[PDB]
C-alpha cells in the first residue's frame, strides 16, 4: 500500500550510502508521522575521492539530478496521492534544487534548464528542505540564515523557482560552501541549528 507521506533524503559528499546529514530532518518527519516511509537517493555523492567511486563533483551532481528525478517521478506514478517531502544536505541539496527548480547548473556542466520532476510530481511535493546548498544566493524568498552572499554554484541574480513556496533553504554567513565565509564547521551544523524550524515548516505544509 502507498503511504500517506513519503520522504526522500540526499546525503552530502563522501558520506556513506544512505541519508548522511539529511537524517536529522528525515527522521524528524518519520517520527512526526507514524506510517510514513523514507528512501535515500542513490547517487555518487562524490567529489573525485576513490572512497565514493571517483566521480568528479560535476559527474556526481549530474548523476544525482537524474537520480532525484527518476526516483521521485517513478514513486509519484506508483503512488499519485502520496505527499512528498524532499531533504537534501550540501551536494544533496544542490541536486534537489536543480531537479525541483530547474535553471540548470552551469558551473557543473548541467546544461538543461527545465524542471526535472514531472508536473504531477511537483504538485505532490509539499515541502523541500535544503541545508548548506552550494547554489544558495541571498535574496530568494525561500532562504533562511545569516548568509548575505552566496556559494560556489550560486544561482544568478534574478532567479525565481516556480516551487518557491514549498522550500526552505538554510545557509549561514561563515559557511565557505553555501556562503563566502571561512569556517567549515558551520557547514556541518545545520541539522541541530535549523532542524526544528525545518520540521515546523514541513508540518505546516503537510497538515
Gaps in the chain with C–N over 2.5 Å, residue before each: none
Resolution of the model in angstroms: 1.1
Domain ranges of the chain: 1-207
For 105-109, the CB contacts below 8 A with 24+ separation are: 105/61, 105/65, 105/135, 105/153, 107/152, 107/153, 108/57, 108/58, 108/61, 108/62, 108/153, 109/58, 109/62
Neighbours of 21 (CB within 10 A): 23
Question: ∠ CA(120), CA(121), CA(123), 5° rounding?
Answer: 70
SS3 letters for 124-177?
HEEEEEEECCCCCECCCCCEECCCCCECCCCCCCCCCCCCHHHEEEECCCCCCC
Question: ∠ CA(184), CA(146), CA(187), 5° rounding?
Answer: 20
Residues carrying an active site annotation: 90, 175, 187
Residue recorded with cell 527518476: 70
What residues contact 153, with CB distance under 8 A and at least 6 apart? Answer: 94, 105, 107, 108, 134, 135
The CATH H-level (homologous superfamily) assignment of domain 1-207 is Alpha/Beta hydrolase fold, catalytic domain (3.40.50.1820)
Experimental method, per PDB record: X-ray
Amino acid at each position: 500500500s502507498c503511504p500517506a507521506i513519503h520522504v526522500f533524503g540526499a546525503r552530502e559528499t563522501t558520506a556513506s550510502p544512505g541519508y548522511g546529514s539529511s537524517s536529522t530532518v528525515v527522521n524528524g518527519v518519520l517520527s512526526a508521522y507514524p506510517g510514513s516511509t523514507a528512501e535515500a537517493i542513490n547517487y555518487p555523492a562524490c567529489g573525485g575521492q576513490s572512497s565514493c567511486g571517483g566521480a568528479s563533483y560535476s559527474s556526481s551532481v549530474a548523476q544525482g539530478i537524474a537520480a532525484v528525478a527518476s526516483a521521485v517521478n517513478s514513486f509519484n506514478s506508483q503512488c499519485p496521492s502520496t505527499k512528498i517531502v524532499l531533504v537534501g544536505y550540501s551536494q544533496g541539496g544542490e541536486i534537489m534544487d536543480v531537479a525541483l527548480c530547474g535553471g540548470g547548473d552551469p558551473n557543473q556542466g548541467y546544461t538543461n534548464t527545465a524542471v526535472q520532476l514531472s508536473s504531477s510530481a511537483v504538485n505532490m511535493v509539499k515541502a523541500a528542505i535544503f541545508m548548506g546548498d552550494p547554489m544558495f544566493r541571498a535574496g530568494l524568498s525561500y532562504e533562511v540564515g545569516t548568509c548575505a552572499a552566496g556559494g560556489f554554484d550560486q544561482r544568478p541574480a534574478g532567479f525565481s523557482c516556480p516551487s518557491a513556496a514549498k522550500i526552505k533553504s538554510y545557509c549561514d554567513a561563515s559557511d565557505p560552501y553555501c556562503c563566502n565565509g571561512s569556517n567549515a564547521a558551520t557547514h556541518q551544523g545545520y541539522g541541530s541549528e535549523y532542524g526544528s524550524q525545518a520540521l515546523a515548516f514541513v508540518k505546516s505544509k503537510l497538515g
